[PDB]
Design a protein around this ligand. Structure first.
Ligand SMILES: c1cn2cnnc2cn1
Length: 182
């Protein structure tokens, strides 16, 4: 509808796949080469479905900060025959607050879904499903089940992936450039 939705659509149309695990269907962001991210609660194993194709997982790493606290981001390397557009230059370098973000989701249940979530707070600590979690972004939108893995963008930046909500607020795990150095 406007330039925020423009940037979000550009990311969805080239840098997402539908990931299925035994814990459900997730929006999955591809970052570069065969490397993607998904919420750690997706419980990625040795095999995953990518757009309904059986795919070997070459590596999966559940990130934690240097205090050994959950970040809720798993970095997955897929045995896929095709690379993702490199979007690492759209990742923030530092923890920050943002204005006027969009949450985008693409699953079988919620295809081509875009949500203007508004102002994003560097919330920090969250007890997420009973798990102490750091680097949490918060937005004041009543998100629901089906949206986990959804991409949080501003114009020109890919800032997080949706990992939970409390019925009134939604929560994303930050993406930082430093997670994807090679
Ligand atoms: C339950 C589950 N959720 C996932 N994302 N937001 C929510 C809210 N309530």
């Amino acid at each position: 509808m406007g330039p925020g939705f423009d940037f979000a659509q550009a990311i969805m149309k080239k840098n997402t796949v539908i990931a299925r695990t035994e814990k459900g269907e997730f929006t999955m962001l591809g970052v570069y080469d065969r490397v993607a991210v998904i919420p750690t609660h997706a419980s990625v194993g040795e095999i995953i479905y990518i757009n309904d194709v059986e795919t070997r997982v070459l590596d999966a790493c559940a990130l934690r900060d240097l205090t050994d606290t959950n970040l809720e981001i798993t970095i997955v390397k897929l045995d896929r025959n095709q690379k993702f557009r490199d979007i690492r230059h759209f990742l923030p370098r530092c923890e920050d607050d943002y204005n006027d973000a969009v949450l985008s989701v693409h699953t079988s249940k919620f295809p081509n879904m875009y949500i203007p979530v508004g102002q994003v707070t560097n919330y920090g600590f969250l007890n997420l499903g009973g798990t102490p979690t750091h680097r949490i972004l918060m937005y004041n939108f009543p998100t629901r089940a089906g949206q986990c893995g959804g991409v949080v963008t501003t114009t020109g930046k890919v800032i997080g992936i949706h990992v939970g909500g409390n019925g009134a607020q939604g929560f994303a795990a930050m993406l930082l450039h430093s997670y994807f150095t090679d």
